[PDB]
Amino acid sequence: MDTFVLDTSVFTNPDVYHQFEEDQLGAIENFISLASHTNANFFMPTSVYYEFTKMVSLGDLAPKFELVVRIRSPRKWGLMVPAEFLYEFIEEVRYRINKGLRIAVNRLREKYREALRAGIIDSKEDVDVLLLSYELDAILVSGDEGLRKWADRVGIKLIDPKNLRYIMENLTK
Amino acid sequence: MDTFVLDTSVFTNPDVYHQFEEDQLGAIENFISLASHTNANFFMPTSVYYEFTKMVSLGDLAPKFELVVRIRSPRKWGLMVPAEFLYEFIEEVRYRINKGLRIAEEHTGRVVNRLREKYREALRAGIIDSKEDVDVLLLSYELDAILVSGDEGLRKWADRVGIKLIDPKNLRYIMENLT
Amino acid sequence: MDTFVLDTSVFTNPDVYHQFEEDQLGAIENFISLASHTNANFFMPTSVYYEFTKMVSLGDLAPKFELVVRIRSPRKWGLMVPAEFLYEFIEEVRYRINKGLRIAEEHTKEVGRVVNRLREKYREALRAGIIDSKEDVDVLLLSYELDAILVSGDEGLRKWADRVGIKLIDPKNLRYIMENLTK
Amino acid sequence: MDTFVLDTSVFTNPDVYHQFEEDQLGAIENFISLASHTNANFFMPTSVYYEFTKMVSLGDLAPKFELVVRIRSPRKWGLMVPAEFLYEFIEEVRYRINKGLRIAEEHVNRLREKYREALRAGIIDSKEDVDVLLLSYELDAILVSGDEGLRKWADRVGIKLIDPKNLRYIMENLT
Amino acid sequence: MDTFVLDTSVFTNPDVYHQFEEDQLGAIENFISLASHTNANFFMPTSVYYEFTKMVSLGDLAPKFELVVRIRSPRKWGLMVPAEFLYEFIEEVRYRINKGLRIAEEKYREALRAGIIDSKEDVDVLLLSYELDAILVSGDEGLRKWADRVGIKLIDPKNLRYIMENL
Amino acid sequence: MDTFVLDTSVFTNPDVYHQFEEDQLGAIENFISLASHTNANFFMPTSVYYEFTKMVSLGDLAPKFELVVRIRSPRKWGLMVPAEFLYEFIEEVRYRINKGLRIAEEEKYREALRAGIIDSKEDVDVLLLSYELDAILVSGDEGLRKWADRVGIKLIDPKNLRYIMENLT
Amino acid sequence: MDTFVLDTSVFTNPDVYHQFEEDQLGAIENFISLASHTNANFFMPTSVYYEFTKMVSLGDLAPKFELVVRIRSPRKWGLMVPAEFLYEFIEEVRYRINKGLRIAEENRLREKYREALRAGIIDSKEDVDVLLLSYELDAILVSGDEGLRKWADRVGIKLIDPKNLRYIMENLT
Amino acid sequence: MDTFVLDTSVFTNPDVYHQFEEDQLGAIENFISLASHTNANFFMPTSVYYEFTKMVSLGDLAPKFELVVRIRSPRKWGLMVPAEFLYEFIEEVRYRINKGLRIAEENRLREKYREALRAGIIDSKEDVDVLLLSYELDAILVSGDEGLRKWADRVGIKLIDPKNLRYIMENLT
Amino acid sequence: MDTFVLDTSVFTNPDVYHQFEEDQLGAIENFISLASHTNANFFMPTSVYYEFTKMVSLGDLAPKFELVVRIRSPRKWGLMVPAEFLYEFIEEVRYRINKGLRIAEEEKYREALRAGIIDSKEDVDVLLLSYELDAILVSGDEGLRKWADRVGIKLIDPKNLRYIMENLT
Amino acid sequence: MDTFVLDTSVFTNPDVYHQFEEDQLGAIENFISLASHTNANFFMPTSVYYEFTKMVSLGDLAPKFELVVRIRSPRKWGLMVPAEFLYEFIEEVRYRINKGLRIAEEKYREALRAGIIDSKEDVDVLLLSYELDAILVSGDEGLRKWADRVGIKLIDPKNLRYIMENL
Amino acid sequence: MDTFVLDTSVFTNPDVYHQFEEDQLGAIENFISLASHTNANFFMPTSVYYEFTKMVSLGDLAPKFELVVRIRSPRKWGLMVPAEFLYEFIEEVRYRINKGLRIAEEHTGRVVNRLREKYREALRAGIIDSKEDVDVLLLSYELDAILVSGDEGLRKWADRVGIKLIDPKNLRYIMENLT
């Protein structure tokens, strides 16, 4: 039975969520409905779910979302990663900060200070996503191309996020 | 099938128990009834159950409650925790004591004497709550269970150490979808 | 050769340090001098040495002390303690916070400002009971890791050390022990 | 026999190097001379040595330095660090970026580059931090550093430490 | 399926056996009947069963009892307990005897030699419970507090009938 | 080099201490002096040393004693004993209580046993320490050394302790 | 399913075999009959079966008995017993002979005393065989001899009252 | 350096002790004297030393003997012997008693026959103790009893001719 | 399900094959027919089957026989036997040679032993195969089954083979 | 230092012992003298030494011999040989006896019962050599060819004196 | 100290042995003399030594040679080689047989009969040489020794499988620098 770990970008990037509906809230609702009738487990890291809720107001959808998408933390005890992964994470932080810095009087340096604090949060989400995907042996669904490139050098299973609805449909119990 | 370890706050904090009914005994009895018809195991550490019985008089409910919610002790023999966990526990005691000390101070010859006994009850309960926290975490770890809490402090420790969690406000909803 | 882990109390409790000299700074300086000519390794946890520097001002003694007493952190990686040590610590915490409350109140057994001064002396008591509990863990873990003899003076810590199988000495005989190991 | 892993700050922060000489190039030279007669091993990560050379021109000292201080890379092959360490590293990056900008903030076109530079050096110094810790862990060595934030981290992880102000002193008490 | 290890106290302390019947022999008889029709294994240490028979005369009930409640010895070969457990046992002996002599008011020499027999029962009970991963059913506060320190599964003995019924 | 774990009865039973001197305090003092020159390690469990101090007032000898005979606790962390040893302990408690009860039979019944428990806890501490250090158990108590024999702990005649100490410089 | 290892005494001591029938060969035949319709495995050591056959003639029953009661040797190849067990066996030899010696006390006196201890060691070798086989198969020892059952208990072998063997077999069909 | 485990028979059988001196207590004293100046460790099981003391009074010599010959118990805690060894011990009991029984054949007849087999099992328990201790220390067994030495050989314990013990000790000073 | 390793003597000793039929070839044929319907695996070592074919001419029965009783070699690669078994083998050779020598004593001395060696090699092949498969050894030879007993291999009375086969559909 | 395991053939076959002396008792005597002054351990299996004493009467040489040549049994507990070795032993027995009867020309029954005694010696020799990691000294072609198949260290027995001398 | 395993070709190929002297027996005896005063162990497989004795009559030299060059058999009991090695051996037999077949052909009613016996001696020696090669490699591996050969074919197999090598022409020089 296929397990998936979802990124923040799955429901915040329009290129991905448009497959459910053009509205954000409507796409999320459609996803939740479909997730009930599909033979799949969905997961999302605690940290990622937190940032998703800061961006999108789910309200009455939250409990249904939390029922179909299990929110687990990847911080297992005694989990060890090889030293190499540590060094690759450093490169991911570089990517994240510099990407945020590109998109940025003194609203250029409280923009800039906000960009790097977001860049750290995005990196701590990336590692949470990968670790959880690794632990569950799950398929990582993510609109962030930079994350997906890293999930490959590390050998995590992937899907084209644009085909998530399609995949889900062809697995209905 | 899903396993849950319940904290004391599941049935003592109104924000959580109101999903079952509006009376404490009503909520407990509604929970027990539903637990019978749900495909799930429930557990509560011995220490947590003890404090729960001091705060609430179950009476005739106790045997039914003890049947649906299994009371186990998490004090395993060959169990080992990393030295990290030990240091994290010290921070939880700090959190517990200082939160309990805030609430003593705020309520605030004769006024000096009610304040000393109010600060002793703040610390002693702060330690009791910290020992319960550990019991809850260890049991959750051992059974690979979903910790149902409500005490934001505990839930955030549970998260640091990778224990499974749920929003306690959605407990009834989850139970209803596992019948 | 013998290895020792030192508590704060070895140089702050007068019943212990008098063996070197009657003054505090004099006792510490005398200890350092003797430690140089003794065939023994001395250690103190980073957390404990920090509290020792907050209570006593070593000044020019610091570098000599830091040479004879090695200041190491016991927070090794993958160190695992059994789960019973977790519960025994919960109990030391209790003993500690309580001993302190005792002195807070018992010291304050003694306008309305009285209430605020009592409020502080209670606050200070728990904050220092948690600092002394963290010290206690640090001391035991360091003693365990090095297989060292714990020199304390604190009854509460030594009782715990004994429960967990850590080697102990009478702190009052430290100078004597050191003298019978000269190189 | 004692082993030490040196940080850049040992020879770039004056508060540390003054124990050898007031002069930077003289402190380094004095250190090198003493290291020859000291019963100790010295090490410095490859990345750390690279940054040290970009700040200080050693010239004819380089070969003597490279003989007394062995320049090794900690990027071993089967090394596994706990997942926790990974999260600790993220916090170290936060500390170093935020320390860099606090410096930057104080001194429009010059500001955008003073802020790029703040965080590119912030990442480089975080990579140096990891290199230093991993090498210290691998060799079971005593980490000598002037940076507070690195020395604070070397404690959470249990790496052996020294007051850098006492380095000369320690070296002298080992022949 | 839930396994259980029974103490002597289950059928000798009236507070516990009254749930089956007011009569002692009738409670045992009722328990055995119910045990047949419940999806649960029952066990009792050799040493505990011996003392139970010295106190209660079962007569024709014995073979039915021995069929529903399996009598095993916990003395498996190569079983190792942590040194800590050994020290905790010493404390249990202290508890057992001190209680016993309170009760003295030749009756000192019986309060000792019974206090140790009760201690040997306690160990046999805990070890068997540990080995089978069973739920310890016991009236005795002291045994149940020790069982808890060592992480053995417990039940309120007063709800034994109720639990059996719901299986 | 030879390691020894000492019981309480080494310095509290006259049959054993007479080899050092006729006086108790003098035998202890003679032992301490001889221990300093001897090529052997001496040890005594914490619990055993405590009871020894309650019986004998060492005074100024305590620091010299605590230098020659090292007072360790045998309650090591990951230590496991076979379940059989646990059952052997129960028999030792019976031996100790019944011996203490015979002598009582002339509050002296209540403390005939409370001492019997303390003596049994000491016995365990002595055996475990002996096991851990792979040491020779020196004890005058018959019952303890007969147990020590069942569990394969090395033994000596306590009456020959001085002689053995002398044959090791 | 339950497994049992049988002693000689289960069919030679009258106090146990009377549960099947009053006559010895009749009891054996009833047992065999019942064992066929029982949901249980029966075993007896080779050495024990040999002495059983030297005491009872059996004849016609032998092939039926050998079908229901499997005769195995417990001398497994890599079996290790604790040194302790070795000492315990010396005590069992003592018990076995000194018993034998009580009967004898009731030339021929020598010829009775020699015969007493030679049968004593044969019975000791039976005891070992029985315990080892019970251990190997994790079987319930059905004996009748108190001394063997006391030993079996110290060693933690599963036991039953031999007087209830028929009853147990009946409740497993 | 060479290690030896001694039997009772090394100082109770005259055929062996005569190499030291004709008198028993004189031989023991010479052995003790020589053992002091020998580069070799000597050992004897607790059970063996006990029976040795019940046969020879010794007295004055005891502390010197206990210094040169270390009296250890071989009942080590985690010792495992193969099941095979257990069977071999049953044969040793047989040998030991049937021998004992030959002497007896030469009331009192009973009191001689009881005494014969009680000493036989005591000697069997000695044999085990000796072999186990020899095994544990990797020591050379010095016996005098042929039956024990035959066993020691089947088990692969190191052996010496007891008649050459003095000679061996002399060539190690 | 039950597995059996068969010796040569199962079909070459009349005391054993008479249960199937009075004729040799008829007993073998009856056995093969019964084996097909029985819920049991049969095996015979390669070496044993070779000698069986030299003694009895199976003709058209061979393919049916080789279908019901599987002919395997027990010379597995990483197989190790304890050194004791090696010494036990030496005693088996002595038994086999001396038995063959008694019967010889009436080139019949030279081949009294050469057969004794072949029979000893067969014995080893039989035991090793039985050990490997955890099979029940069926053999009429007294000496072999008494060895099989010493080494803990499962056994049956060969006289009851038909009866056992019948009680397994 | 080089350890050696000696066969009977070392002191019973004249081709080998002639290097010490022409006389048999003198060769043994000479060997023992040299053995004392050479930096090498010597060993011989129990079974081999027994047969050696049945053939040669040593008398007063025995204790000196037993001091220089340690007589151990190879029957260590738990030693395992590969199944292959077992089959190779069968072949050795075949070799030993077949040789033996050639020689027959009651003398058939002795050529067998000696052929097996020689086989049991062969195993004892190889196992001891294996256990000690020793050099096997043997006159017998057949034993030395087997020793070679199993990877045991060998020497030419004719050069034994020479090797001892250079140590 | 350095250990060496010698091939048959060390003393039979002149290009190698000429470093010691110009006569075969001269070279062997010079080698033996030097081997006595060098801090090095020498070994040769039993099979290799056998073939060496067939080709050269050592006589009185044999005991001295056997003392300096230890003749061991590499047929270890628990020794395992990777299945690669097995396939590589087949290629070595191909090399050996085809090299030996070339030399038979080249030398080349009566001519047919000397050619059949010349092709049988080419194969049978080709197998003998292949078994020697394996013995040499296995012994070298077991002792972690330096293979001294000269047979270019063997040296190139030895290299594929990571055995230590030396130029055989420098053997004397190496021995001289280890005195």
mmCIF file of N, CA and C in Angstrom, chain C residues 111-120:
data_model
loop_
_atom_site.group_PDB
_atom_site.id
_atom_site.type_symbol
_atom_site.label_atom_id
_atom_site.label_comp_id
_atom_site.label_asym_id
_atom_site.label_seq_id
_atom_site.Cartn_x
_atom_site.Cartn_y
_atom_site.Cartn_z
ATOM 1 N N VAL C 111 5.682 46.456 56.895
ATOM 2 C CA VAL C 111 5.108 46.827 55.564
ATOM 3 C C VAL C 111 4.551 45.557 54.908
ATOM 4 N N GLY C 112 4.355 45.611 53.583
ATOM 5 C CA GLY C 112 3.947 44.463 52.791
ATOM 6 C C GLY C 112 5.012 44.023 51.783
ATOM 7 N N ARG C 113 6.120 44.766 51.656
ATOM 8 C CA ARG C 113 7.244 44.360 50.830
ATOM 9 C C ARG C 113 7.742 42.987 51.285
ATOM 10 N N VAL C 114 7.422 42.597 52.535
ATOM 11 C CA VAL C 114 7.860 41.319 53.084
ATOM 12 C C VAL C 114 7.481 40.206 52.114
ATOM 13 N N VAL C 115 6.305 40.328 51.492
ATOM 14 C CA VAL C 115 5.777 39.299 50.609
ATOM 15 C C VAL C 115 6.693 39.141 49.402
ATOM 16 N N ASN C 116 7.187 40.234 48.797
ATOM 17 C CA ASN C 116 7.995 40.201 47.585
ATOM 18 C C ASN C 116 9.364 39.590 47.841
ATOM 19 N N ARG C 117 9.922 39.914 49.002
ATOM 20 C CA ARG C 117 11.208 39.382 49.385
ATOM 21 C C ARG C 117 11.100 37.885 49.647
ATOM 22 N N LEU C 118 9.976 37.424 50.206
ATOM 23 C CA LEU C 118 9.717 35.998 50.348
ATOM 24 C C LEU C 118 9.544 35.374 48.963
ATOM 25 N N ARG C 119 8.880 36.080 48.045
ATOM 26 C CA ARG C 119 8.634 35.570 46.708
ATOM 27 C C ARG C 119 9.932 35.360 45.964
ATOM 28 N N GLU C 120 10.905 36.255 46.177
ATOM 29 C CA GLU C 120 12.187 36.109 45.508
ATOM 30 C C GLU C 120 12.958 34.941 46.124
#
